[PDB]
Design a binder for these strands. Structure first.
Lengths: 600, 42
DNA sequence: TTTTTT
């Protein structure tokens, strides 16, 4: 307690040193902490300092014994700037009977403010008067921030980590100590915290970062231990904070975030409301309890599996994959009205030319007047990738404006770390729930090696379906695509479009291939054929199974891909064997086609 | 007992970085229990 | 910037 008498008797005596010492250049003397740490003395990791043990006070642990202190517990990230210690609970009656108050380490004097409270203000001054401390380079707020943080940290410490800590941290000495610490760092040597270093457009923006969520619904606060900005959250982060799967004091680590707001040389923390730290889900994630806020040792993008990833949650700074299947190109037109049109090559050659012929018709007519506009088409390459080691829903990654050599660079059955890919929803009759990998100008690729056995586990090269299988209802193959070889037995192509082609194998099993495009030609019966990339489909011609022919589909009368031959020349056998095959075929179709016993 | 100043605070940083860590799937030990947050739960 | 079939 004491009496207000012998109070301004150091308060109005304190200001003296402020002035009188601010009338010169001071002698910056390193504080306690700073020196200790600087020493040759062996140091400790919270990790070890707790015995590879992590927090065990789940919503109030029954054993307040250790050192309770209901004067902290009721502290939370928000009420850390407030607080103020009670000079009566942490003392007794010692050096409080005189007219001095309390001198708390490192030097300098704290003026146990009137009512019996010592908080924010006090220490600021009780700092200004501290050795080597030049209150000419600081404020009562700059110390309102650092006060807050520190407190909060400490508080915790006791909590979750008692059998090692207690009220050994709530000592304004301890406290005022780091308070000084800070000085010797942020000022004395001028080593800026992460945030402060970035909110000052001085060090590479939001690349790698581990931060702790400081406050809360429109948006939230993140701190690097020194300062806190407000983050800009995306749809699924929101959905977390909303669900409570992310709460203040939890540590996250983000990647390639971005600085929205004040694109100007922004002063250390304490700026507008326009600024914000934009962080995207697919670029950030939960961090281990310790982890050390701030930047981060290895900046080189951390790989994630596709298994996670949100449509709505930004770019995947990086994925390490294996390229299951690679595909045939595509040409896409943005019809004036907006709509898109996908076109095969030998199918955007046709239309390709169609235009040309009419473009031509235009000029012809332009001059039959002077004498007597273009097409928004672009190219795209799509391939099927998968997160490396494990199982997943495969991902469709699409590189626009592909590139001459690149066809021969990313191949099937190879491993890649693809850096920087935008992520979007699936939307494609053929894959509905999944996500889309779309390369950007940013993107870059790395081919990493793979073990013959780790290979055969993840992968699945292409192989020519057996036919048989297709009847069976137990054939739930990969995403539904298949490749095949057979001989053409009949080509029904009714007007009311969508031709069918029946092929049969050497054993006379048939299937029909509904065509979504125009018949590659060469497709006359009795012809050896090799389809690639056919979609699967329920059934069709009462009895015989179907397969749809895509923009991505392929056919050939002379295949080079090895995976066919084992079945091609296997087919060549019956083919060449006789002709009574090209004939046994009909029999069957007709037979199937008309059923066991029709009106003979 | 445990010193309290040689202990590397989960925040004392180094000038420039050169002088596992993240949980794979978002929603789904060292991750679940954040110190600073155990506080608000109590 | 991302689409189809008796």
């Amino acid at each position: 307690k004491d009496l207000m008498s012998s109070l301004q008797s150091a308060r109005d005596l304190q200001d003296m040193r402020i002035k009188n010492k601010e009338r010169r250049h001071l002698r910056l003397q390193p504080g306690s902490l700073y020196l200790t740490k600087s020493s040759t003395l062996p140091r400790i990791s919270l990790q070890a300092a707790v015995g590879d043990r992590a927090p065990s006070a789940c919503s109030p642990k029954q054993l307040y014994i250790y050192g309770v202190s209901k004067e902290c517990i009721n502290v939370n990230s928000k009420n850390a700037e407030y607080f103020q210690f009670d000079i009566q609970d942490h003392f007794g009656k010692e050096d409080l009977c005189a007219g001095k108050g309390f001198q708390l380490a490192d030097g300098g004097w704290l003026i146990p403010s009137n009512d019996g409270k010592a908080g924010k203000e006090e220490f600021y001054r009780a700092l200004c008067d501290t050795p080597g401390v030049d209150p000419k380079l600081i404020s009562s707020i700059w110390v309102a921030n650092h006060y807050r943080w520190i407190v909060w940290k400490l508080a915790a410490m006791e909590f979750a980590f008692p059998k090692e800590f207690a009220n050994r941290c709530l000592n304004p000495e301890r406290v005022l100590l780091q308070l000084k610490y800070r000085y010797d760092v942020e000022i004395d040597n001028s080593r800026r915290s992460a945030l402060k270093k970035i909110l000052e457009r001085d060090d590479t923006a939001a690349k790698t970062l581990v931060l702790c969520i400081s406050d809360i619904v429109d948006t939230i606060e993140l701190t690097d231990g020194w300062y806190a900005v407000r983050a800009q959250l995306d749809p699924p982060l929101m959905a977390l904070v909303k669900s409570g799967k992310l709460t203040v004091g939890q540590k996250i680590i983000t990647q390639g975030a971005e600085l929205v707001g004040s694109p100007d040389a922004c002063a250390p923390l304490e700026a507008p409301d326009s600024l914000r730290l934009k962080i995207s889900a697919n670029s950030t994630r939960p961090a281990r309890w310790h982890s050390r806020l701030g930047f981060f040792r290895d900046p080189r993008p951390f790989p994630l599996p596709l298994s996670s990833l949100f449509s709505d949650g930004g770019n995947v700074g990086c994925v390490d994959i294996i390229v299951q299947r690679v595909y045939p190109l595509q040409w896409v037109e943005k019809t004036v009205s907006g709509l898109y049109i996908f076109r095969s090559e030998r199918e955007e050659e046709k239309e390709a030319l169609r235009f040309a012929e009419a473009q031509q018709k235009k000029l012809e007519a332009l001059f039959t007047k002077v004498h007597t506009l273009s097409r928004d088409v672009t190219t795209v390459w799509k391939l099927r990738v998968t997160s490396y080691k494990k199982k997943e829903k495969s991902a469709l990654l699409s590189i626009w404006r592909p590139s001459s050599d690149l066809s021969s660079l990313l191949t099937e059955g190879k491993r890649y770390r693809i850096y920087h890919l935008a992520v979007s929803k699936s939307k494609s009759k053929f894959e509905r729930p999944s996500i889309q990998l779309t390369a950007t100008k940013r993107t870059q690729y790395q081919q990493l090696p793979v073990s013959s056995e780790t290979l055969l586990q993840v992968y699945q090269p292409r192989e020519s379906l057996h036919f048989s299988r297709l009847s069976d209802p137990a054939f739930q193959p990969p995403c539904s695509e298949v490749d095949v070889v057979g001989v053409v037995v009949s080509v029904v192509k009714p007007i009311g479009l969508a031709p069918l082609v029946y092929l049969s194998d050497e054993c006379l099993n048939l299937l029909v291939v509904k065509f979504g495009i125009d018949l590659n030609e060469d497709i006359k019966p009795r012809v050896l054929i090799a389809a690639s990339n056919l979609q699967c489909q329920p059934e069709s011609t009462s009895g015989v199974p179907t397969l749809f022919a895509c923009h991505f589909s392929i056919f050939s009368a002379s295949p080079k891909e090895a995976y066919f031959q084992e079945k091609v020349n296997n087919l060549k056998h019956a083919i060449e064997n006789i002709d009574t095959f090209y004939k046994e075929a009909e029999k069957k179709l007709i037979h199937v086609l008309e059923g066991d016993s029709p009106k003979w | 007992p445990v010193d309290l100043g040689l202990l590397e605070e989960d925040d004392e940083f180094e000038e420039f970085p050169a002088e596992h860590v993240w949980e794979d799937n978002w929603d789904d030990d060292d991750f679940s229990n954040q110190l600073r947050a155990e506080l608000e739960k109590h």
